[PDB]
Write a protein that binds this ligand. Structure first.
Ligand SMILES: O=P(O)(O)O[C@H]1[C@H](OP(=O)(O)O)[C@@H](OP(=O)(O)O)[C@H](OP(=O)(O)O)[C@@H](OP(=O)(O)O)[C@H]1OP(=O)(O)O
Ligand SMILES: Nc1ncnc2c1ncn2[C@@H]1O[C@H](COP(=O)(O)OP(=O)(O)O)[C@@H](O)[C@H]1O
Ligand SMILES: Nc1ncnc2c1ncn2[C@@H]1O[C@H](COP(=O)(O)OP(=O)(O)O)[C@@H](O)[C@H]1O
Ligand SMILES: CCc1ccccc1-c1ccc(CN)cc1Cl
Ligand SMILES: CCc1ccccc1-c1ccc(CN)cc1Cl
Ligand SMILES: CCc1ccccc1-c1ccc(CN)cc1Cl
Ligand SMILES: [Mg+2]
Ligand SMILES: [Mg+2]
Ligand SMILES: [Mg+2]
Ligand SMILES: [Mg+2]
Ligand SMILES: [Mg+2]
Lengths: 324, 325
């Protein structure tokens, strides 16, 4: 395959000392759990059990993410990344790192966000509200990309939003990685519906632009009221769902440009598809959330060619956000 | 008999935890593979061990192998359990592995390597700021082990590794450390002579975490006054007389009366009568750059006969001596 590198913040980690990005060598100092009293279960994801808790030393409400048995390397990476980004705009704040004394179980302690329900937001959000939130996510992405980090798991479940206080926080940094120009990354990241074409065709030299694809999938689902937008039933099918909208001509153009070897499992399922106009997804139930600016912005994020997508900074300058 | 005492902080942490946490006799130790380690050179040799620098040949990383001398199996299990409980704590040495010699069956503890700066070479280069910085790093380790229900009981410069170039500090040698259980009577034959608190020297067995705060005070006094050790006893009885020559005998009798302590008759002819000395009397031209009103006030609050009257590690961290760190 042909090499590629990010168009923005390409060398931010190259110019920083090993202490910044070498998470394997990072020294983690675990706090005592006793400061925290667990209140109730909040969530339960792929590699954790999340609890609402009270820090009994200051009466402050927190969230305790009890980590499931995984590679110690992965826990160190999530901790190092959270420490590097701590205080960044709309980045969840890691407050403490604790281990259960008796069971020796790692747990991350975060600021509590009173998260408004996904299906609840889906119905009440206005055209201005969507623009405002997208802009808040873009602030978090431009910041972590500027700090030489790719989230690699951008999706609605990893975006906490307190509507009453208009607060948004990008969470779940467990799949996040440091960007190094020319590095070949694992493509088994992100959640199926939000996976970039680069991941599905097994192109390993990807960058921050992967996050911009995932963000495009989120915007399309909100404006069109179709969740998820690209509804694959497996990883191979996921690319077919993408091809049914963007077309197969631009898909072959993409794989030819990067000299990508397409897996033979795509032989009988990909077919031939024309590019669809974004205007075809507009209906009576969603027309109040769609506009020429929204469609133009969406078209600029949902591109096969990861180099052709808007960067988080270019996205912030788009006419879609002039009202925010 | 003697009046009972208990720690003012973290009193009941072990009482509220299951036996698995503090019952080290029942702890199941799993021995690793010795062949992963190749010994490089001798680093140290204490009362209980021969310590070697080693290479972990599976990852080319430097480690330290502490080969343990013939001692009670109970003591080895205790050190292993405490180290496992404290693993990952701030400035606590990390136990990386536990191994056995396949032939002699000698146990050995494998630790993270610290590139320890020579104490004599450190003694002259350290500034007032460096002393405050390293004292704060030791306090982080002590507040942590005390919060985990453990007393270190051997706090001294030789058990504090400092890699000065990286400003890295590790509290090591947990071989004498014990679990704190309120009301328990402990062996007073712990710590090294110069760092032994008055409770140990008057044979008051119901001591706690505050013993570590006295030892820390001895270390601070030796650094800011450039006098090592600060209390230079020639034996355990004389060690108390050295303390009494500084803190005075009036406060010593006040301490033993408060706890109804029976003073051993061997103190009859050696203790004498001594006035309390002002801390300002130990200030000289060679050490005045390391001394300040805040340093003397902090020192005065750690070096108290009454173990309950001493600052806890957490109160020490809030002291005006640490505002610049
Ligand atoms: O090193 P120095 O500054 O000279 O002082 C010390 C100190 O004496 P002072 O406190 O009276 O200055 C020690 O005496 P004590 O503290 O025990 O009373 C003495 O220790 P010894 O009693 O073991 O001699 C030690 O000697 P050394 O450094 O050899 O241990 C001696 O130093 P001098 O050797 O110069 O007297
Ligand atoms: N800071 C937080 N505030 C409120 N709820 C949270 C917070 N962090 C996580 N949660 C909840 O816990 C769930 C799982 O957390 P997450 O970090 O995504 O773990 P996982 O890696 O297992 O997906 C989230 O989807 C959310 O509902
Ligand atoms: N992690 C370490 N890194 C570097 N040197 C060490 C380390 N642990 C011990 N040493 C050296 O070995 C000596 C003896 O170690 P220690 O644990 O204190 O054993 P003992 O109980 O016999 O005193 C120390 O005083 C120090 O010089
Ligand atoms: C549906 C994607 C989206 C696009 C634009 C604005 C908000 C969102 C959004 C909706 C719900 C949730 C639920 N935690 C999270 C988010 Cl980020
Ligand atoms: C004779 C030294 C020793 C004492 C106790 C436990 C283990 C060891 C030990 C033996 C052999 C080797 C070589 N790979 C390495 C080690 Cl560390
Ligand atoms: C002399 C005690 C002290 C007080 C304040 C700061 C540093 C120290 C100190 C000096 C040397 C050594 C040797 N490993 C260790 C330590 Cl901890
Ligand atoms: Mg998640
Ligand atoms: Mg999270
Ligand atoms: Mg020692
Ligand atoms: Mg040790
Ligand atoms: Mg020992």
């Amino acid at each position: 395959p042909v090499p590629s590198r990010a168009r923005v913040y390409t060398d931010v980690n190259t110019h920083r000392p090993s202490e910044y990005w070498d998470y394997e060598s990072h020294v983690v100092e675990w706090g005592n759990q006793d400061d925290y009293q667990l209140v109730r279960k909040l969530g339960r994801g792929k590699y954790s059990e999340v609890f609402e808790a009270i820090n009994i030393t200051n009466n402050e409400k927190v969230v305790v993410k009890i980590l499931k048995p995984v590679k110690k390397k992965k826990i160190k990476r999530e901790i190092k990344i959270l420490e590097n980004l701590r205080g960044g705009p709309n980045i969840i704040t890691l407050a403490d790192i604790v281990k259960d004394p008796v069971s020796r179980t790692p747990a991350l302690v975060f600021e509590h966000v009173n998260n408004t329900d996904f299906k609840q937001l889906y119905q009440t959000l206005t055209d201005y509200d969507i623009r405002f939130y997208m802009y808040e996510i873009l602030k978090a992405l431009d910041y972590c990309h500027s700090m030489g980090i790719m989230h690699r798991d951008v999706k609605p479940h990893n975006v906490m939003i307190d509507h009453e206080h208009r607060k948004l926080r990008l969470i779940d940094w467990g799949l996040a990685e440091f960007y190094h120009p020319g590095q070949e990354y694992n493509v088994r990241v992100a959640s199926r519906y939000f996976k970039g074409p680069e991941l599905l065709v097994d192109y390993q030299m990807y960058d921050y632009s992967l996050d911009m694809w995932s963000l495009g999938c989120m915007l399309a689902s909100m404006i069109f009221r179709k969740e998820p937008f690209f509804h694959g039933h497996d990883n191979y099918d996921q690319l077919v769902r993408i091809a049914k909208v963007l077309g197969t001509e631009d898909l072959y153009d993409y794989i030819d440009k990067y000299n990508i070897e397409l897996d033979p499992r795509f032989n009988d399922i990909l077919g031939r598809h024309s590019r669809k106009r974004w205007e075809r997804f507009v209906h009576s139930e969603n027309q109040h959330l769609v506009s020429p600016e929204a469609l133009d912005f969406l078209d600029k994020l949902l591109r096969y060619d990861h180099q052709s997508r808007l960067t988080a900074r270019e996205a912030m300058e788009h006419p879609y956000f002039y009202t925010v």
